[PDB]
Coordinates of C-alpha atoms and ligand atoms in Angstrom, one line a residue:
X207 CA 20.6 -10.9 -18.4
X208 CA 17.2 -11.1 -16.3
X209 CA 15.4 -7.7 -16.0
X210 CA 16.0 -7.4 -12.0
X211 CA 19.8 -7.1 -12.9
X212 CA 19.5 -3.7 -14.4
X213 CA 16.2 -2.1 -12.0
X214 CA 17.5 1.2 -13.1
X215 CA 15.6 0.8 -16.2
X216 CA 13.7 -2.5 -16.2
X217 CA 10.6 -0.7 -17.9
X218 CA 12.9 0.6 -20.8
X219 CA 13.1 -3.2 -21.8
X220 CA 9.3 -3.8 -22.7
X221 CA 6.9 -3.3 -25.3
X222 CA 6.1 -0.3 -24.4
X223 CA 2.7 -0.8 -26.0
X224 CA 1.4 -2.0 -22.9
X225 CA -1.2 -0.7 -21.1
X226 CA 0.0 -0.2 -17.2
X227 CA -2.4 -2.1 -15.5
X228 CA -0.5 -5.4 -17.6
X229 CA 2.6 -4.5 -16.5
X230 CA 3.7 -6.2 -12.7
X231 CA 4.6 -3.0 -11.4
X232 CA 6.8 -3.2 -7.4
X233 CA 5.5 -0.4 -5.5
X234 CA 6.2 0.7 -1.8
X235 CA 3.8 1.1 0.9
X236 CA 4.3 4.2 3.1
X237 CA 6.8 5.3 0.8
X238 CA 8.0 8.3 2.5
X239 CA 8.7 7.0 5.8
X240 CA 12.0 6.1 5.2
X241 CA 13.2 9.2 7.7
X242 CA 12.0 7.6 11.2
X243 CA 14.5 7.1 13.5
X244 CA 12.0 7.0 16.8
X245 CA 12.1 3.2 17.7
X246 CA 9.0 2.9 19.0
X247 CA 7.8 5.0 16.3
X248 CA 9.0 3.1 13.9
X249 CA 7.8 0.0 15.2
X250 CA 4.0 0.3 13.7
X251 CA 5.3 3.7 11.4
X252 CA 8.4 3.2 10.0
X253 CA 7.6 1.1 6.8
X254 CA 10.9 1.7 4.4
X255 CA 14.5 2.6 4.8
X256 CA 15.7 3.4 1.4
X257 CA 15.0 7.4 0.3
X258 CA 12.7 7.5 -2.8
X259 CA 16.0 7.9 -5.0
X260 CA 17.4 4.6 -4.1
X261 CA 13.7 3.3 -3.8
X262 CA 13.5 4.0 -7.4
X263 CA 16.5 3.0 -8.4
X264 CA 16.1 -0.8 -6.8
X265 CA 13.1 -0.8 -9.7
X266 CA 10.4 0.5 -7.9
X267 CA 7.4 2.3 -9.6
X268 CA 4.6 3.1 -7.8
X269 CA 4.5 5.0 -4.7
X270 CA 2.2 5.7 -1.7
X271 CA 2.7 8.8 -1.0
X272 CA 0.6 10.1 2.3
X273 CA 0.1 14.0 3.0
X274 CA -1.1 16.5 5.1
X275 CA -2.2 19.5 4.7
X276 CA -0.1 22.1 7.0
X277 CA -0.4 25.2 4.9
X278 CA -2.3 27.0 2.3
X279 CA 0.4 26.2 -0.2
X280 CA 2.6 22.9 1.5
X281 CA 1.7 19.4 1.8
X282 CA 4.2 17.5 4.7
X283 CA 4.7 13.9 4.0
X284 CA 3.1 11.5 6.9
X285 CA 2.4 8.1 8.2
X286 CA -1.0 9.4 9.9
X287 CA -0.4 11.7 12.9
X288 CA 3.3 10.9 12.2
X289 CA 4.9 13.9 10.4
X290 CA 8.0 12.2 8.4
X291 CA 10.2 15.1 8.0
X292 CA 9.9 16.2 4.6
X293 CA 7.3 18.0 2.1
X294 CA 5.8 16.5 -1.5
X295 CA 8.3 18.7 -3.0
X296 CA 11.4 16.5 -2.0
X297 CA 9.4 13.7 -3.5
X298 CA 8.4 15.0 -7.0
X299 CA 12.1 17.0 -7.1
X300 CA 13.2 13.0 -6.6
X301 CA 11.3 11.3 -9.3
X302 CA 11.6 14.4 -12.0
X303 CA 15.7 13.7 -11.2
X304 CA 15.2 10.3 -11.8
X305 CA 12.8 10.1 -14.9
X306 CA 15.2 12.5 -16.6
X307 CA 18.3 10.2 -16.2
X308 CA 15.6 6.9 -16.8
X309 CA 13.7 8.7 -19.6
X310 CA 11.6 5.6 -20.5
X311 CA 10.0 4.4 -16.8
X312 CA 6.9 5.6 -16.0
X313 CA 6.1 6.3 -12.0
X314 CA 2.9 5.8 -10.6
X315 CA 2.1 8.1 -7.7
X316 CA -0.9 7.4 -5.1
X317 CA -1.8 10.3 -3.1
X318 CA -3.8 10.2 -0.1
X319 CA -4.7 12.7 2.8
X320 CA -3.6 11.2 5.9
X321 CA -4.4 13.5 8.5
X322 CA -6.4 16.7 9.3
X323 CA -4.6 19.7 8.3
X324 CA -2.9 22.3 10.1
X325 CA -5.5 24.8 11.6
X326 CA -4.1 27.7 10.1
X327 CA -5.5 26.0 6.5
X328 CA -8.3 27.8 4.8
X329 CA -8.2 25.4 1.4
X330 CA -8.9 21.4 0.7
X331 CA -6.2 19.1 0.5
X332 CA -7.4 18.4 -2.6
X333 CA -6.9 22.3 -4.0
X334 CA -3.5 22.6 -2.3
X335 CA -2.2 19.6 -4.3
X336 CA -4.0 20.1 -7.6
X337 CA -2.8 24.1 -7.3
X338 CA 0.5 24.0 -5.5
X339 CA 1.4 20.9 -6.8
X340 CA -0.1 19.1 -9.9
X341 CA -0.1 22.7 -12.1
X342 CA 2.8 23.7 -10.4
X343 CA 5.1 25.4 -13.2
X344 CA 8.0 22.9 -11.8
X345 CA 5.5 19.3 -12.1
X346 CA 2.9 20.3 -14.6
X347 CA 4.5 18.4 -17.8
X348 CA 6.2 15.9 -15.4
X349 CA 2.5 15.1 -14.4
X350 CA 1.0 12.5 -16.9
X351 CA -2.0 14.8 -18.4
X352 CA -3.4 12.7 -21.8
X353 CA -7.0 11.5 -22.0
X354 CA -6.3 7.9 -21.9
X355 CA -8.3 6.4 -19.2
X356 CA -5.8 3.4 -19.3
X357 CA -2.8 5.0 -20.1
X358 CA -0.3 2.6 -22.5
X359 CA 4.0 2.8 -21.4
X360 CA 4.8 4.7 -24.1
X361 CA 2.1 7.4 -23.6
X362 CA 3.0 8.0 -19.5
X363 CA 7.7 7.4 -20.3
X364 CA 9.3 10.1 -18.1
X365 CA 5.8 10.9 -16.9
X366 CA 3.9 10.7 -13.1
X367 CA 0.4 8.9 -13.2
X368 CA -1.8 10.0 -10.8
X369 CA -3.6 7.4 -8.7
X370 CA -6.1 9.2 -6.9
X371 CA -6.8 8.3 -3.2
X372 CA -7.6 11.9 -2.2
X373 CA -11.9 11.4 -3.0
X374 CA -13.1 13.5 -5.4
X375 CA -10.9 15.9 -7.8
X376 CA -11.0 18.0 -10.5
X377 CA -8.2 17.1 -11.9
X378 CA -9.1 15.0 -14.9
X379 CA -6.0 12.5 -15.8
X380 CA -5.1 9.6 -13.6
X381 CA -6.6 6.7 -12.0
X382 CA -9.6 7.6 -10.2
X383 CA -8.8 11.4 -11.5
X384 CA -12.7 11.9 -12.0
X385 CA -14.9 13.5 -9.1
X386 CA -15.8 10.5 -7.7
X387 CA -12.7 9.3 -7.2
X388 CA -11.8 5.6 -6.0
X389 CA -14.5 4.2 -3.4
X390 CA -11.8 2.7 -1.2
X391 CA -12.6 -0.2 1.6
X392 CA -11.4 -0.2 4.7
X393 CA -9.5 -3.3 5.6
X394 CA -10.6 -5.8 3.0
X395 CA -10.2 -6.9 -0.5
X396 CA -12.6 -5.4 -2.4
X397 CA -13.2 -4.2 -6.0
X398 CA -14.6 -1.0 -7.5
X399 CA -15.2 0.8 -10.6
X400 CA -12.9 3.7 -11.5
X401 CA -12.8 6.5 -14.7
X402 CA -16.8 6.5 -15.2
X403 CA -16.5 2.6 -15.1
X404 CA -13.5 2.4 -17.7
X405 CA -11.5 0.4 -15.4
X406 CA -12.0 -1.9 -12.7
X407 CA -10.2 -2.3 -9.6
X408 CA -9.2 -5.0 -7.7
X409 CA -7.5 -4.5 -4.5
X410 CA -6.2 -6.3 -1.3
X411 CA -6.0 -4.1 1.1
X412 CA -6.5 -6.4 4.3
X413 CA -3.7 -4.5 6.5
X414 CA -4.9 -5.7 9.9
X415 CA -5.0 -9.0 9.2
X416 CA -2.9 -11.4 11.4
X417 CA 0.3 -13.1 9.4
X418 CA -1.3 -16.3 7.7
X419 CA -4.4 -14.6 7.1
X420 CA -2.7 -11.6 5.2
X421 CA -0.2 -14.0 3.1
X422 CA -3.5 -15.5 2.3
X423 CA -4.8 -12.8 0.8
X424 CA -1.7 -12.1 -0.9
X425 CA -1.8 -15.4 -2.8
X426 CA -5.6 -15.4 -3.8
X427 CA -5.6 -11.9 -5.8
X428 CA -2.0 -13.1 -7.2
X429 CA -3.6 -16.7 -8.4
X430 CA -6.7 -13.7 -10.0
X431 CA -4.4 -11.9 -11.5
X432 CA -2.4 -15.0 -13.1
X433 CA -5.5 -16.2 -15.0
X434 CA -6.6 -12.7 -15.9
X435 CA -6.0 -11.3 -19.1
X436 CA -8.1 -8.4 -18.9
X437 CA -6.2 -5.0 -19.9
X438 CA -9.0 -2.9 -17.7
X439 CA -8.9 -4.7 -14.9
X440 CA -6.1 -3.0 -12.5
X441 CA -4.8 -4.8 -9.1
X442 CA -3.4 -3.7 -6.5
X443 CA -1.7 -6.4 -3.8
X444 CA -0.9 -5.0 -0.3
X445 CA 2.1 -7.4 1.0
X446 CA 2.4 -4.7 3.7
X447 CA 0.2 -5.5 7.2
X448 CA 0.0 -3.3 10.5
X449 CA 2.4 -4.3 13.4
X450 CA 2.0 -5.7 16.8
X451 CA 2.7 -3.7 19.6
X452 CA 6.3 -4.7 19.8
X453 CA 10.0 -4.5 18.4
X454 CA 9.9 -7.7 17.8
X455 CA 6.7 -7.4 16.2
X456 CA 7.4 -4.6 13.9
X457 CA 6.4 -3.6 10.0
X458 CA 9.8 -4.7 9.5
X459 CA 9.8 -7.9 11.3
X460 CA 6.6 -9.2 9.3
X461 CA 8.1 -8.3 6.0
X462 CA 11.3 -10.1 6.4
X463 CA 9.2 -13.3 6.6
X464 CA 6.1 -11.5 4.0
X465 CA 8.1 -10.6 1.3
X466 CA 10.6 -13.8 1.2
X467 CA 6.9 -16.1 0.6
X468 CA 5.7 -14.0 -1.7
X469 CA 8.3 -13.6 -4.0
X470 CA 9.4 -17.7 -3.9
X471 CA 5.4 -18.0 -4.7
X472 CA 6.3 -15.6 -7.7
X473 CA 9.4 -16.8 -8.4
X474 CA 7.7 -20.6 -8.9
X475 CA 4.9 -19.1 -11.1
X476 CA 7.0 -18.3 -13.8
X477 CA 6.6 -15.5 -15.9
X478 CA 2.6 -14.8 -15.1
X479 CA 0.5 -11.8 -14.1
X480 CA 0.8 -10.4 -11.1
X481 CA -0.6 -6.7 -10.8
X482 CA 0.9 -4.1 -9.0
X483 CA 2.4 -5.4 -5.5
X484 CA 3.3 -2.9 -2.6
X485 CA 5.6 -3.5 -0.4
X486 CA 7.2 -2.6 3.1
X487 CA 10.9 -2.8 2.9
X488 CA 11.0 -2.1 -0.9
X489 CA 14.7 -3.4 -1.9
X490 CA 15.7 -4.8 2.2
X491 CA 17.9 -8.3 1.0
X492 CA 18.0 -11.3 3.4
X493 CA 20.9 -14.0 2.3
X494 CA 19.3 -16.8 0.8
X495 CA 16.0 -15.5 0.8
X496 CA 13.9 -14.2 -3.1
X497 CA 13.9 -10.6 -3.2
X498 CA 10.4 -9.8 -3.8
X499 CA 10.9 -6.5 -5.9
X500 CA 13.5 -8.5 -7.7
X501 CA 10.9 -11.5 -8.4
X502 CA 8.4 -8.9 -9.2
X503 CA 10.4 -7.5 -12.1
X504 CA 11.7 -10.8 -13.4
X505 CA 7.6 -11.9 -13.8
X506 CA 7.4 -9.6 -16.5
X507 CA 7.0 -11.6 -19.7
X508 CA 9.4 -10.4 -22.3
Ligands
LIG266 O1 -2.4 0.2 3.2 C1 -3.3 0.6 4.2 C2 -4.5 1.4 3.7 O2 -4.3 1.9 2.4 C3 -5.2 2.3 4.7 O3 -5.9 3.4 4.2 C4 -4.4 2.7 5.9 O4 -5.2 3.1 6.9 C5 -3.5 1.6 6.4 O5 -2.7 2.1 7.5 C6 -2.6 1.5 5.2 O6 -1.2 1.4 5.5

């Protein structure tokens, strides 16, 4: 009966009248780094180990999705330096397969440039994905294209919003789609203006903070977004931190006792604002611990 039962299609079930920036959206940090196998790697790297498919299918809806440039037409998935074994094709094949079977989610994609490009590149990463990739033939309806600064659910079902972390663009629909793009502040929390000051942003992005000091964080921009109403503010909460250097202090090892806090903290706030929460470990279970994608879905007032 509660939303999180059914994460196939949790955004089916509500007014879709709502503007996204109300709805508590889970979203997964790193998104595509699922493929590491490298232990040390994977240590600081390795952030997720559910493929976007099954991502999406535990209810998650907005994705970081990190690039490089490594040819004139071909942007390679990455974790920085760390190549993770697949292009942005596999990803945008993945959600069009999805949205077509879950016709009435939306997907919110973030794209960043993680690395330099290849030296054989003559063109932006910028131009590569807005030609190759945005107004490809395949992706250019499955790409959210209206007007609407603050786009509602119903405008953006079976669509991908673009939330732009590339700097400036000339593509025009999306968060941050503007050539300005998102003014982005290195590890803090921080808040900008985005769309020619339609929207503003709210973010907490403190990812080298140590473990108290990032649940912190965490919890103040949650206890913001609970008392805020305010259908043009958007925020962004990063449960996801940088490792130590250490197996036993990996991304993973932080977010089996990150994500459990979070969501109780959720969970005992009722049915209350939250913003859009990204997570390592999107969907990873511990026996008699809150799920936190589950807690973020079931905080969705209905
Ligand atoms: O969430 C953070 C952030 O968005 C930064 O740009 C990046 O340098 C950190 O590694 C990342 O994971």
């Amino acid at each position: 009966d509660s939303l999180s039962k059914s994460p196939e299609n949790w955004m089916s079930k509500l007014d879709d009248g709502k503007h996204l920036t109300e709805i508590n959206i889970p979203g997964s940090h790193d998104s595509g780094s699922f493929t590491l196998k490298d232990p040390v790697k994977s240590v600081w790297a390795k952030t997720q180990d559910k493929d976007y498919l099954t991502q999406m299918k535990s209810g998650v809806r907005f994705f970081d999705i990190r690039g490089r440039a490594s040819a004139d037409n071909m942007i390679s998935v990455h974790h920085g330096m760390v190549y993770l074994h697949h292009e942005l094709g596999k990803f945008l094949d993945d959600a069009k397969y999805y949205l077509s079977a879950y016709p009435n989610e939306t997907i919110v994609m973030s794209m960043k440039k993680d690395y330099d490009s290849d030296s054989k590149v003559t063109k932006t990463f910028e131009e590569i994905f807005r030609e190759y990739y945005y107004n490809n033939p395949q992706y250019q309806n499955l790409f959210y294209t209206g007007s609407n600064a603050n786009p509602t659910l119903k405008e953006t079902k079976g669509k991908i919003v673009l939330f732009n972390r590339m700097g400036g663009t000339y593509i025009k629909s999306g968060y941050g789609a503007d050539t300005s793009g998102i003014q982005w502040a290195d590890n803090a929390t921080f808040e900008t203006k985005i769309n020619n000051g339609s929207l503003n942003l709210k973010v907490q992005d403190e990812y080298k903070d140590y473990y108290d000091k990032k649940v912190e964080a965490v919890k103040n921009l949650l206890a913001k977004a609970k008392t805020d109403s305010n259908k043009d503010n958007v925020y962004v909460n990063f449960l996801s931190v940088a490792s130590g250097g250490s197996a036993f202090n990996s991304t993973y090892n932080y977010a089996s006792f990150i994500n459990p806090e979070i969501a109780k903290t959720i969970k005992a706030n009722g049915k209350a604002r939250t913003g859009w929460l990204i997570v390592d470990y999107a969907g990873y279970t511990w026996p008699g611990y809150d799920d936190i994608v589950s807690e973020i879905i079931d905080s969705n007032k209905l």
